[PDB]
Write a protein that binds this ligand. Structure first.
Ligand SMILES: Nc1ncnc2c1ncn2[C@@H]1O[C@H](COP(=O)(O)OP(=O)(O)OP(=O)(O)O)[C@@H](O)[C@H]1O
Ligand SMILES: Nc1ncnc2c1ncn2[C@@H]1O[C@H](COP(=O)(O)OP(=O)(O)O)[C@@H](O)[C@H]1O
Ligand SMILES: [Mg+2]
Ligand SMILES: [Mg+2]
Lengths: 345, 469, 517, 50, 348, 50
């Protein structure tokens, strides 16, 4: 037994030495890769090396993802798809100022709904002979707003809803769809999408502005003042419809995370086209040729057209790390370093 | 910036909101401010749960009276730390690590986090060395383990505090190491009593006291044991010399954890305890241990709620101890002190291979006699003693003399009986109880056995009543 | 001597062969975390009971699944969980390494050695929740598993495939009974016969680490670690480890049972596994019932104990004998978890504190202790010498009220009283001293054959020991006949009786008198 | 027993010290290969000889 | 197009969402698939509640270890159905009707739903009748009721299995009848033991064994008595035969019902049993009755918690028991078979 | 401490109805004058034993 004990201590200190050997080994490899990849060309070499592995990544049984339609439990979904089909029928009616005033009045009546909860409860009964409800709503704004507005509100309240916040958010959603069509007519769809994404970047990376926009109880006039003001502080946001969207969204934040709400806005904007968002991270921005490579290989993977968002971070030490919805392909070399470190014997 | 904001205050539990990415880890220490001039202070909050949506549920260590919603909460980036080193000896400390008798003392010491992991299993070693106290019943039936885990169980007001004072007098007065005393949710009068009495016996210069008492909110009563245990762990791991750790009513740790379990949003367990009862008791009780070559002789008092030894808190504490001295109120009501239940108390070194053959034989015979007496007591109460056998009457006389001879006049009870204390070596105890069980003193009255020391005291008090032996 | 260049070469080959194919992983995000539970949004394809890996090598088990999040139990190092971390999907349910490399090791409830003696060579892996043997895969329990304790082996026999509950308050000798049962298999191990060898697994749930150290030391001093594994979920481990430790110990020992081997598994304080599961279920906010238990706790224990089976000869003939341990409080066998495990097992050994204090050790209550397998788990010798024991002990227990009026008793009544006193002295046994079956047969033959009526009741124990000692020194052939033939023939009975007579005329009592009739 | 104890304890102490001497004196000589093994690990992690 | 999908998995409780016009009726049998190759199986779910929003809460009958959210759930359109007919004699089934000794046997029999109604008040017998077994102690001191319920209080080693085989023989040879054995919470060891003893005594050909074992979720332990009772009801009503139904530990049926009630979030009654304890006990015991000349006589093993005959479970059970047979060990030691205690046994 | 009063001791004529066995004062002789500390030294224990 004493012999066994001495063998135990010998072998255990042996394993200890092995471990602190491997740790400094991975340290040395880490600084070696860090000073090697400092070559601006070698970062591109690594990423387009990973790109051929991506070329040998097919296939993937991807599914289309929806902005909030996949969030509502039931009864509200059917209602939401019915209303989006109704607005798809509406799609060509309104004109420029038509659509913009549609959005303004719809967000105003959303404020009106969230101002009187009891009337929302009443108009959100999931009953069959909903006709008194529709009377109610026109009784509210018979001479206050536009006619197709009142029509779509009628067909909305005609539907059944599992809750109250579902209809509240649905009218916001159809107003956003109207603004999306307005931006579409102008032909800036990818422009507005990527500018919302970039504003989401600058909103999340310095979340102070995000939180000071999340003030629930504070009135929203100063909120939108602050917001637009910070936006048109520079004119790299020449497009005004982005400002319209974000303003009439922050008007009814309802305690939502701004740093997530703006991503939600961008994602529904891209989802209008049927594309799937795909965030990516790397250490240095690549040429737009490599962007074409990435978009084509990701479309081949997920069987849908996709858009990217390159959030620069050098600490990833080259390579890419992509995330599509709720799965991740992590090829950046720093993740491999952490893996080989944690998987030491 | 990267600070917090108080959102909810429901008693001692405070909800705080932080920006995304600046959420403090679990068990961090946050600081909030109470500016009301009559109650102005700096609240320390210990992060307990991550509520989601950047919310954080914390437990306050000071009373939250005067705390406003929306005030700034500063994340210290670390857990609660206490001063450690050979310089904490001789001073009364806080649950936060603040010196009470000399404020500011110890802010320049090394500071250790009060949250540790228990030693690895390959470092644990069984302890089978007897710690001779000097009490007849303890030395005979519940031999304490040197470097092991000892506890005193008992209801409300039987003998626990007096017994721990007695053991501080016996074991710690002539010790070659360090002593640490944690007063976990106990009286403050007793804390001042201990402070003064350790200053009198010149023991304070070797002892470090850490007090969080009954008037403190449940956070202090939940963390004071961890603070004192961190001091003891420093004395064991860095200095490495023979720590003594006394803890008064450690249970108060469990009770303080139970007072806030519903405010933290946990469904209650069987008897109204937290669902995490045994898990927290194990996380705490596994750090109180002696590793290989490094000794901590621990001694805790365990309150048994409503004298029910089936209550989940003592029933869960029972599994962490090497020796248990279990005090009864039935023995307290008879005037026998210390009120040890000889049939319930136990020790793991009560082994013929550890204490010897004669010690073990005498202890087993005493236990058998007392069990037979407890079995006959009801018959004797209803039908009378004259209904028994002659063997049974002999055994009943012997058992009454034995249960009176297990009592003793302790050194720490002079304040309650006016009588000075006694000390009896273990060999004298063994031989005395051997003579009792054999029947050498069946002619001495039942008194003259009551609150005395060895056999010389027995002879003195027997002759004081007109008898010999 | 140390192989340092070998240590170079090991990590050398490791790093020269390292590869991590960038495969598509499914990740989720921690939304909340507290008290050892973490809720993870995302992970659509995660399955129930699936292992998840948090940042920092932390493990969890996906218990609760709903449309919002995934409630997972953290298996340790929980204070490192934060809101916002990412959780990876493993794609596997809880599995444990299994093989012969676990004999003599102390392991986690994950197959990780915590003794420090190096990694464990694993044959294969085995899922924790594999189904129990079918009702047509089993076979009648017929082979005895000798505990070495006279009271159990004689009154409540245990077979190979039986589940016997050791139930008692505390400090009554349950751990001692199970450790003696383990130590008694040392001679079975030294035989080298895979039909006689019993491999032991000891699961320690919720125990102080020093208690597990003491148990392992007791097993080592008896040479019992050559065939014993210790699955330890100490008192400081998470509720997840305390809940999973019996299933880890039972996943091991099924790799052996299905290989045609015989295993004995001890679950020290299944009550503590029940409290850990109750903590987990109350933190996951599942509906509580009696004593706040989740409502599937009877399932928790029956699913575990129904895997201790006696397989058919078509499946190899292996067996797994279960010894669960239950701590009652104040002898309340009518509590919830005692009721469950009494309902599940095949028999119960009730250890009592009053009997323990009376000097009756092991403190088994032979009146209420039962074994529903019965004489089918006894050798013919023990089956016939112990049949004359239960009735004698019952008659003694019903006559012991007249212990002080033997003058007023019939001659048969006083004879039964004295024989019962001698028999009660016969079933006592020291701790960590198990007896082989032939010595127990000889001892119970002394008791029931009338050969102790001449000995003072305060000497019986000694007499028994000494006689066995004599027979271990002079007449080994009697013990060899009983061991190899499993029966006590008439010739062996005559030889044993005359040996007893000679020893009696050579024996010296403590009262001074002779023990000759 | 005590004889089998004192002997094994003494040889345990003397072997522990001898293995400590082995350890400290062989700790740093193997670091001649830590550089090249770090290099080959970097080559594996990049997918190129660099 | 008309199938559901898993939404929540909480142990044995599984919530399934269906389309707007395809909600399964209460007590329906649903089928889900666990494809993880180690635990690959077909889960049978029983609809327990309609939660609203097309959600139904079902109790799983197999362990749900390995179930994924979103898995398709198929609605069978009927409750749990067991195979009925003369061919179920001599075989072992589970609570769902799957043959254990010969997998696949019985799948092309007639299948009967285990949720049936007792005979109408028009059809019940208004006059009690004694069942003459032929045993002296029973026919004299503890006369059995034809179509009634007899409690059995025999432990281990008093010949309970021997008395069971005896009753099987007598009901098969004196009445031209059948036996059905429902092992509610059956120890698998004792289940296999009973199987091989009934096969050795050549009385298995007159018995149908239905085993809801102990290692199973509370659903099958709650429904195995109904499965065996459905087989017995087919033998009585359709075949025109006297039946003897042995329910081993009806207390385990009560206890499984209590566990299922706790899992569904229902508030407990007194002591701790389900709020609907008497209604479930009645729903089971009222189908064991005499009807149209034929009857189902039941012998039930009863467990009394803490020897408390006022405990809600035995107090609810004894409201339906017509006789009591206590097997004594003092009588078995005297060599008296059957070991019926003549003073502890009783009849109404 | 505690001064536990009982209904049984009240009806028996013991008034105040203090249960001398379970009643106690944790300050003790420090809360007495010298004369009462000496004369009432072990009164509570004597009465419990009685
Ligand atoms: N057969 C025996 N003879 C004498 N002493 C015994 C015997 N069995 C056990 N003991 C003594 O009982 C003491 C405690 O027993 P043990 O620890 O085995 O009980 P337990 O069931 O494990 O209780 P717990 O789990 O609460 O500690 C031990 O110190 C041991 O010395
Ligand atoms: N050895 C003793 N001699 C006399 N009185 C005692 C003794 N031990 C305890 N007591 C009595 O018990 C009372 C309270 O005991 P204590 O141990 O302080 O209670 P607790 O165990 O609840 O802390 C004391 O006031 C004292 O009068
Ligand atoms: Mg006290
Ligand atoms: Mg134990």
């Amino acid at each position: 037994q004493g012999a066994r004990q001495v063998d135990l201590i010998r072998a255990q200190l042996t394993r200890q030495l092995r471990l602190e050997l491997g740790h400094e080994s991975v340290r040395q490899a880490r600084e070696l890769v860090r000073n090697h990849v400092a070559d601006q060309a070698q970062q591109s070499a690594t990423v387009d090396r990973f790109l051929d592995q991506l070329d040998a990544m097919a296939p993937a049984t991807a599914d289309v993802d929806y902005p909030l339609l996949a969030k509502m439990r039931s009864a509200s979904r059917r209602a939401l798809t019915s209303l989006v089909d109704w607005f798809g029928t509406m799609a060509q009616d309104l004109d420029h100022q038509g659509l913009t005033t549609l959005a303004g009045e719809l967000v105003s009546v959303a404020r009106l709904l969230d101002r009187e909860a009891v009337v929302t409860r009443y108009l959100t009964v999931p009953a069959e002979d909903a006709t008194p409800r529709i009377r109610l709503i026109e009784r509210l704004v018979s001479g206050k707003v536009g006619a197709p507005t009142l029509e779509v509100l009628r067909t909305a309240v005609s539907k059944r809803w599992s809750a109250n916040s579902d209809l509240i958010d649905a009218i916001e959603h159809v107003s956003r769809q109207a603004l999306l069509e307005l931006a579409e007519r102008a032909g800036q769809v990818d422009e507005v999408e990527d500018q919302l994404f970039r504003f989401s970047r600058i909103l999340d990376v310095q979340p102070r502005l995000a939180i000071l926009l999340g003030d629930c109880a504070v009135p929203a006039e100063g909120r939108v003042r602050l917001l637009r003001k910070v936006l048109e502080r520079a004119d790299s946001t020449v497009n005004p419809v982005v400002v319209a969207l974000l303003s009439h969204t922050v008007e009814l934040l309802r305690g939502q995370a701004v740093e997530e709400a703006v991503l939600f806005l961008a994602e529904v904007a891209v989802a209008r086209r049927g594309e799937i968002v795909a965030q990516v991270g790397a250490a240095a921005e690549l040429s737009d040729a490599q962007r074409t490579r990435l978009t084509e290989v990701l479309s081949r993977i997920y069987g849908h057209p996709v858009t990217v968002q390159l959030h620069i971070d050098a600490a990833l030490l080259g390579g890419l790390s992509i995330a599509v919805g709720d799965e991740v392909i992590d090829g950046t070399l720093s993740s491999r370093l952490a893996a080989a470190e944690a998987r030491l014997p | 910036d990267t600070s917090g904001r108080v959102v909810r205050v429901t008693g001692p539990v405070v909800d705080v909101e932080f920006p995304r990415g600046s959420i403090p880890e679990l068990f961090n220490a946050l600081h909030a401010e109470i500016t009301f001039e009559s109650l102005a202070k700096t609240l320390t909050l210990e992060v307990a749960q991550h509520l989601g949506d950047n919310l954080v549920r914390t437990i306050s260590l000071q009373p939250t009276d005067g705390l406003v919603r929306g005030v700034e909460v500063i994340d210290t980036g670390r857990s609660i730390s206490v001063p450690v080193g050979e310089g904490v000896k001789g001073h009364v400390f806080n649950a936060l690590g603040d010196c009470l008798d000399e404020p500011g003392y110890g802010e320049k010491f090394e500071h250790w986090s009060i949250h540790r992991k228990p030693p690895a299993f390959e470092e644990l070693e069984p302890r089978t060395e007897m710690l001779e106290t000097g009490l007849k019943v303890v030395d005979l039936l519940t031999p304490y383990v040197r470097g092991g885990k000892i506890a005193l169980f008992g209801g409300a007001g039987v003998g626990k505090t007096v017994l721990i004072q007695e053991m501080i007098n016996r074991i710690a007065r002539n010790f070659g190491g360090t002593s640490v005393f944690a007063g976990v949710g106990e009286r403050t009068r007793e804390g001042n009593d201990l402070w003064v009495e350790l200053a009198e016996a010149n023991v304070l210069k070797d002892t470090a006291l850490v007090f969080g008492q009954m008037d403190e909110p449940p956070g202090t009563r939940m963390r004071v044991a961890l603070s004192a245990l961190t001091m003891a762990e420093w004395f064991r791991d860095e200095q490495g010399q023979d720590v003594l750790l006394f803890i008064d009513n450690i249970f108060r740790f469990t009770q303080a954890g139970s007072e806030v379990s519903t405010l933290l949003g946990r469904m209650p367990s069987a008897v109204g305890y937290q669902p995490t009862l045994a898990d927290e008791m194990g996380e705490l009780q596994e750090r109180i241990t002696s590793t290989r070559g490094r000794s901590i002789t621990s001694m805790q008092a365990v309150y048994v709620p409503a004298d029910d030894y089936t209550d989940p808190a003592p029933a869960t504490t029972f599994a962490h101890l090497d020796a248990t001295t279990e005090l009864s109120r039935a023995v307290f009501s008879k005037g026998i002190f210390p009120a040890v239940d000889p049939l319930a108390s136990s020790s793991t070194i009560l082994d013929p291979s550890v204490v010897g053959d004669e010690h073990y034989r005498v202890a087993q015979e005493v236990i058998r006699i007392l069990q037979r007496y407890k079995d006959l007591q009801d018959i004797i109460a209803i039908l009378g003693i004259d209904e028994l056998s002659e063997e049974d009457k002999q055994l009943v006389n012997r058992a009454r003399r034995i249960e009176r001879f297990l009592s003793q006049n302790m050194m720490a009870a002079e304040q309650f009986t006016g009588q000075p204390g006694s000390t009896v070596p273990v060999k004298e105890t063994i031989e005395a109880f051997d003579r009792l069980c054999k029947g050498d003193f069946d002619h001495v009255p039942e008194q003259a056995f009551f609150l005395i020391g060895g056999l010389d005291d027995l002879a003195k008090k027997a002759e004081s009543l007109g008898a010999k032996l | 001597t140390i192989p340092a260049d070998d240590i170079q070469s090991a990590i050398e080959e490791y790093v020269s062969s390292f590869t991590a194919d960038t495969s598509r992983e499914e990740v989720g995000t921690v939304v909340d975390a507290g008290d050892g539970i973490a809720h993870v949004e995302g992970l659509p394809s995660v399955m129930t009971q699936e292992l998840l890996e948090f940042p920092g090598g932390i493990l969890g088990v996906a218990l609760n699944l709903d449309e919002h999040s995934v409630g997972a139990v953290i298996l340790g190092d929980f204070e490192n969980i934060e809101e916002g971390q990412q959780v990876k999907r493993t794609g596997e349910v809880l599995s444990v390494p299994v093989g012969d490399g676990f004999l003599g090791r102390v392991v986690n409830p994950l197959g990780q050695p915590i003794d420090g003696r190096g990694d464990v060579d694993s044959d294969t892996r085995r899922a924790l929740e594999l189904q129990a043997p079918s009702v047509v895969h089993r076979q009648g329990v017929k082979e005895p598993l000798q505990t070495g304790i006279k009271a159990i082996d004689a009154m409540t026999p245990i077979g190979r495939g039986q589940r016997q509950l050791i139930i008692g308050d505390r400090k009554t000798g349950k751990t001692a009974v199970c450790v003696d049962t383990i130590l008694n298999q040392r001679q079975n191990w030294e035989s080298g016969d895979p039909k006689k060898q019993v491999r032991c697994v000891y699961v320690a749930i919720g125990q102080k680490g020093t208690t597990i150290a003491a148990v392992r030391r007791t097993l080592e001093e008896g040479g019992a670690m050559d065939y014993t594994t210790i699955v330890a979920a100490a008192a400081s481990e998470s509720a997840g480890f305390k809940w999973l430790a019996p299933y880890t110990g039972s996943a091991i020992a099924q790799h052996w049972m299905y290989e045609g081997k015989h295993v004995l598994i001890i679950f020290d304080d299944l009550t503590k596994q029940a409290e850990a599961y109750r903590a987990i279920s109350l933190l996951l906010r599942r509906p509580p019932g009696r004593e706040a238990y989740p409502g599937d706790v009877f399932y928790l224990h029956s699913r575990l104990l129904e895997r201790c089976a006696k397989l058919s000869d078509d499946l190899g003939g292996g067996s797994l004998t279960g010894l669960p341990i239950i701590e009652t409080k104040a002898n309340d066998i009518s509590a919830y978890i005692p009721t469950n495990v009494i309902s599940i097992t095949d028999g119960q050994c009730f250890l009592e504190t009053d009997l323990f204090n009376q000097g009756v050790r092991p403190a088994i209550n032979v009146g209420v202790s039962v074994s529903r397998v019965g004489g089918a788990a006894q050798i013919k010798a023990m089956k016939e010498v112990a049949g004359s024991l239960r009735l004698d002990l019952s008659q003694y227990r019903e006559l012991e009220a007249f212990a002080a009026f033997a003058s007023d008793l019939d001659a048969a009544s006083k004879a039964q009283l004295e024989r019962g006193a001698r028999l009660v002295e016969l079933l006592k046994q020291p701790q960590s001293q198990p007896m082989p079956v032939e010595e127990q047969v000889v001892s119970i033959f002394l008791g029931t054959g009338g050969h102790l009526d001449s000995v003072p009741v305060e000497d019986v124990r000694r007499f028994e020991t000494e006689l066995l000692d004599h027979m271990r020194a002079s007449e080994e052939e009697i013990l060899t006949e009983i061991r190899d033939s499993q029966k006590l023939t008439e010739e062996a009975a005559d030889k044993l009786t005359e040996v007893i007579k000679n020893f009696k005329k050579g024996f010296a009592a403590t009262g001074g008198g002779s023990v000759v009739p | 027993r005590v004889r089998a104890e004192q002997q094994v304890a003494s040889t345990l102490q003397t072997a522990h010290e001898q293995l400590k001497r082995e350890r400290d004196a062989v700790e740093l000589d193997l670091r001649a290969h830590v550089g090249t093994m770090s290099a080959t690990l970097a080559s594996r992690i990049l997918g190129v000889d660099l």
